[PDB]
Write a protein that binds this ligand. Structure first.
Ligand SMILES: Nc1ncnc2c1ncn2[C@@H]1O[C@H](COP(=O)(O)OP(=O)(O)O)[C@@H](O)[C@H]1O
Ligand SMILES: Nc1ncnc2c1ncn2[C@@H]1O[C@H](COP(=O)(O)OP(=O)(O)O)[C@@H](O)[C@H]1O
Ligand SMILES: Nc1ncnc2c1ncn2[C@@H]1O[C@H](COP(=O)(O)OP(=O)(O)O)[C@@H](O)[C@H]1O
Ligand code: BEF
Ligand code: BEF
Ligand code: BEF
Ligand SMILES: [K+]
Ligand SMILES: [K+]
Ligand SMILES: [K+]
Ligand SMILES: [Mg+2]
Ligand SMILES: [Mg+2]
Ligand SMILES: [Mg+2]
Lengths: 524, 524, 524
């Protein structure tokens, strides 16, 4: 199709206009005194959000060159959300500041590539300084502070997240889902549990709770389909001689076998419960092997070279309790040696180290948690649906921030750490004068987040910026209280990883955006 | 698609305009002197309604920012209708008042988040005060008063609902359906009845009434499809030896078996009637087990491990009377031990405590009522169809309000209880001045429902408001007679749950709406 | 459909306008101080590129005659990219210069065909001069310099490419793919490796690394689907007698055979691994024969006249080590006589000499590299996706330029070699005055690339051009440092093939475009 071509300063002006539109929409949500943005939805009611990436993903402009600018700058927030899960608004603010200063430098006659090289050098030095400035975050009080700050200063969210992270451990998994009441609740499950219930309600022996309960059972792990009871007679006779319950986990069990088992259950010969194997395909085999290692049994598969009729008691696993209901089966205190379990989790860790997509990493981490740690679920409580969505977003942000802080440490919040780094980088020089101008551009842009935080509070950004720059260490400005003090003492903590990622992504996109000379897009 | 972005006060003004349009449409229907709204229908005649949620669901605006405001405020009425079934107009009025006062406070330079926090604190305190202010509603006179008030002061509706609730009991179910005459009628069914008639008109032994009547029969409950008569010969012979009728409840019965049964019926060997089992799938099995527990019999199923030919007299249930017609089968005075029925209803209650959707809860409640309570149907009478729909809506509103009042108690009506609570909360303070302003905003908005009720009557809302505030206790204004007096003595009662829910939902939505700074929507 | 027809000067003016639009878009990216062009994408974010052909392929104009001019001049860049992979911007600049000067000559009253003949003669003489002016490029320092220059002066890219070329050899293959980190990495694989993993995870004997490792195995190469183990019994017995592992490469292996093999593996009877044969169709057979020649075995096929049951130890290949994992199989140090390997690579070389499409040529090259050389992969590191794409394009350009420089030598860069050639051709004369004017047009156009390079730097092209023309040899202008000196000493090298190809293609298109008199296109 026919194209429209713009050259030089006209193209740069249109690009800056689009960048400014997107950044102005995003930046009103930054800090403890930021506000919400209402986003229209074609299907349903509008959503009200304080998240930078959610606002950024909805912005599209009528003018095509301004739209090109906005689409270019949207990638900063997208990448920050993908990487750290937090700090998208800060990244957008940094990108806009760099783009504006660099365009000013280009309009005065500077070489764009040298400016880009200077910006890259300054950002590398800043990343080194941030790494040197970090402190470990291991105590639960610091984790609670990080979660509170990341959830727009909500103490309950931070306390709940700290409790969940303490209970579940280091190898566990925490997820957030919608609740039903008005208060947040935490449900932590220890051991192995999968979303499979009994295949027949007649297996229930405790009708008061509507659940199947078995004490010290046998576990028959079959990686096959059981349809004819003839394959099951020998082991059934053996367990009847033993006199303890049996739990059969199979891919599926047919009607004749169900009828035989429910007949044998209530008649008193044997106590039997049957459920379906979790997962589909190779992952189902992996979960079956995990259960076998946990309970100390062996999976009966055709592909390995054994048949069901030849099974013995040694092949069956064992546990201490089994609780089954309509939806979930939990194995409690399965007898297994720590050597095999540790080997299995080490294998799954090595598998995690060689996987690409995040979904597969999440599934493997869930498996590791089921083997070694625990699983926690946080149910968010709210009166309405818009409130529920907003609070769920805040809780997820706090969860991501706590993970990042635990893995990489914390720095002073409120934009203070970036200012300290920029002050520490005041002697850095490049190869020529344009590279020095680029370094100065990056150092100036490093003060934008604090200025925006103060501007959102209704104060004067230049005065607060000068007062903070006059200090040293963790001295900073509390925007919620409007007071100066030690950032660490008042609990305004930022994870180091979030700050570093925001800086790197913003610089990477803005450096390329500065070097533009021509624009090609479709005609209106 | 391309987006339109508005910032700050322009966005807030447009949102307030949309909110005002929706609230102005809704509020004309509030109180004893509210009026009706005609809603156009694409398929058919227009509907005339006084319901707040019905009006709110139909409002959509041409301007997109005002439409976002209206769509946001619609959720209050939707949530109130879902929760209590009544009090949607009051919730909409409260939400509009909070939004207006909060936008005024924001325009003067207050921090929206602190205003929202103050509003939340005031609403929590108000909920506590309302709980402390409630009184029990157990007598039938108070229930009749509540039903009369909720049906727009219709004494016949309240009296009918009180009679139905007294006859049916605590565990029963009352439904409202269209009638045929000009008068409302109440039909109560005691015992077990399901919507299945006889499978052959030749079973009729009393052609005067066109129905099958059996005195002290046997009940054969088979969870299977009967096609060949050979399965049924032994029990038929045994019943013929016994000499009293038999009722066969099965999934279905084939033509050969029907022919054999109708041949044996009039020839005098045995008295037999056959009907289909109610329900489809698991619920059919649940109802079969319920009938088995009620009549003291056993269900003949293959999946449990028994066959029909091996049935004896023990497996057959017993009753005192069975009446069957074209459409319904009723079992009167089934012979069962109270322990089994109480256990079964306890199991179904525990199942109700673990259900999510309202349909499943309603079905379980109907089953519990069939086991223990009764079932009532109210047929509404009206000359035309618009009148029919209007009166049916009013009766449903009264039914929901009586349920809420029975479960949680009643307070003074006419907006008096909210005024008393706001007076009790006059000393509440927050953390800073913006939170105090938010508390004051909530307390001021708590007087809106009475002001709107009086304004609809054509009186002066400020004078009545001051006079009511000068009183104490249940002193209030009777808008129907234009007099002052004790609200409780005059029968103007509001359920506590409706008032509390309206307050909570209105606050939850309005607090978020106050904190908006930017709006993003599609271009016109 | 109806046509629009233009004659003479109007048509030539419109065509020149379209040429100028495309060339102005392209030329802003030329040289060390060129800038980037943002190209809009219908599906996704815009791409930022410094490549001439990428910009040229996106240009289409609303006016149909100008569009005809642009479409005509786009073929120069397309052909240069197809031929050398580099030098598209230089070719576009040369074509525009020739077109402009030739149109000026035509407008003064000269015969276009004689001008075209003079241009052709000058270009032939220039190609001869460039061939005489080239010097060999064999040392790694010169290759690194060429790669650095072609990657827009990135020393790391040039060093990495030189290392890869040294490690892999002359007959190897180097590819560029997306990385995951922020730094470029090089992975070189020696021997034969194909993208096939094991057919069963139970073959694994080293669970620590999750891989199958076999020391001094036998290799069974069969172009057949194995389903029944009965065909495989004799060779399995024989290798069990031998006592060394066996690797089975087949088209596919059925489930019964997998079960038998996995049962025999862990039981200590024999050590067996099985994978699928790489490729589909004739190429699969070629790869099987290549593996057979490498390992010294024979392929079992029905089409040659042998059966699997009759196989012996002589038919089985041998190797030193075999490593198999989820995705790749690697045969390390297969025992084979160099005579057969050399014959096979000579056969594939002769096949390469008689193939048309680039896909077949590159596949044959990969096969030759697997037989004799190595395979290297360069993973590009970048923070974002736009940066990733830009850097990947630069690395690919450097790779193509290094290949061209190795095969045909290098000349002075910066547009100096063309100027020297034009100076050497100052005595060339044609048959008549129009041909002399055409020769002068070509000689004048040969100075355009340096002028554009200097203009992009913000300097004065005429002054630099005169200063360079006043010199001799490799004297030139360094546009990065704004200094004069020896082109070769400061490492500004251009491959001879790229320069010659750009000149030839630009002349070929521009000569035809000069001779236009009438234009026929569709009505608007
Ligand atoms: N009380 C406070 N005083 C000063 N700065 C704060 C305070 N609370 C939070 N901040 C700062 O505000 C920022 C919060 O940004 P936020 O709105 O979450 O956007 P994002 O995290 O996506 O950049 C953090 O960098 C934090 O350092
Ligand atoms: N006679 C009366 N005098 C004063 N207030 C009344 C009288 N009758 C009803 N009301 C009040 O009017 C309100 C009923 O409003 P209604 O139109 O049913 O809307 P909603 O959907 O909010 O229930 C109740 O809060 C009740 O207290
Ligand atoms: N430092 C330098 N000084 C002068 N000329 C240079 C320098 N670096 C590169 N060049 C010249 O710039 C040209 C590179 O142009 P480029 O943008 O790659 O377009 P093309 O597609 O024609 O290769 C080469 O011909 C090279 O001779
Ligand atoms: F808006 Be940021 F991601 F907290
Ligand atoms: F109009 Be409300 F629901 F009584
Ligand atoms: F733009 Be050229 F192909 F380096
Ligand atoms: K934000
Ligand atoms: K109403
Ligand atoms: K270029
Ligand atoms: Mg955040
Ligand atoms: Mg009502
Ligand atoms: Mg190049």
């Amino acid at each position: 199709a026919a194209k429209d071509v713009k050259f030089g300063n006209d193209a740069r002006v249109k690009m800056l206009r689009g960048v400014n539109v997107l950044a102005d929409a995003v930046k009103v949500t930054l800090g403890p005194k930021g506000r919400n943005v209402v986003l229209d939805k074609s299907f349903g009611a509008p959503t009200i959000t304080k998240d930078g990436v959610s606002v950024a993903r909805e912005i599209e402009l009528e003018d095509k060159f301004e739209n090109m600018g906005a689409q270019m700058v949207k990638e900063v927030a997208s990448k920050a959300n993908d990487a750290a899960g937090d700090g998208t608004t800060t990244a957008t603010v940094l990108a806009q500041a760099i783009i504006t200063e660099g365009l000013k430098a280009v309009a005065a006659g500077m070489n764009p590539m040298d400016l880009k090289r200077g910006i890259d050098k300054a950002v590398t030095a800043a990343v080194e300084e941030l790494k040197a400035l970090s402190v470990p975050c291991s105590d639960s009080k610091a984790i609670a502070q990080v979660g509170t700050i990341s959830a727009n200063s909500d103490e309950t969210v931070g306390k709940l997240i700290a409790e969940a992270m303490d209970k579940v451990g280091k190898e566990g998994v925490i997820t957030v889902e919608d609740g039903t009441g008005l208060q947040d609740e935490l449900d932590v499950v220890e051991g192995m549990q999968f979303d499979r219930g009994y295949l027949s309600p007649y297996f229930i022996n405790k009708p008061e709770t509507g659940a199947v309960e078995l004490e010290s059972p046998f576990i028959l792990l079959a990686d096959k389909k059981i349809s004819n009871i003839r394959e099951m007679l020998p082991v059934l006779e053996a367990v009847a001689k033993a006199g303890k319950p049996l739990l059969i986990i199979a891919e599926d069990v047919e009607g004749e076998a169900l009828a035989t088992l429910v007949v044998n259950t209530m008649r008193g010969i044997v106590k039997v419960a049957a459920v379906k194997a979790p997962g589909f395909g190779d992952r189902r085999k992996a979960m079956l092997q995990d259960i076998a290692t946990l309970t100390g049994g062996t999976v009966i598969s055709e592909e390995i070279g054994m048949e069901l009729e030849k099974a013995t008691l040694e092949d069956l696993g064992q546990a201490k309790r089994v609780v089954i209901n309509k939806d979930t089966t939990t194995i409690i205190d399965g007898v297994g040696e720590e050597a095999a379990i540790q080997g299995r989790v080490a294998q799954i860790r090595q598998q995690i180290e060689e996987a690409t997509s995040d979904y597969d990493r999440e599934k493997l981490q869930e498996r590791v948690a089921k083997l070694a740690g625990g699983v926690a679920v946080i149910k968010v409580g709210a009166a309405t649906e818009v409130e529920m969505k907003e609070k769920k977003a805040r809780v997820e942000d706090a969860l991501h921030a706590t993970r990042a802080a635990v893995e990489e440490g914390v720095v002073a919040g409120g934009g203070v750490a970036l200012i300290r780094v920029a002050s520490k980088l005041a002697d850095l020089r490049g190869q020529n004068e344009d590279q020095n101008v680029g370094i100065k551009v990056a150092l100036r842009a490093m003060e934008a987040p604090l200025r925006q935080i103060v501007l959102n509070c209704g104060e004067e950004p230049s005065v607060v910026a000068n007062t903070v720059k006059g200090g040293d260490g963790n001295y900073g400005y509390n925007a919620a209280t409007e007071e100066y003090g030690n950032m660490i003492d008042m609990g305004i903590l930022d994870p180091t990883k979030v700050t570093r990622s925001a800086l790197q992504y913003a610089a990477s996109v803005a450096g390329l955006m500065i070097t533009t000379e021509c624009m090609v897009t479709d005609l209106p």
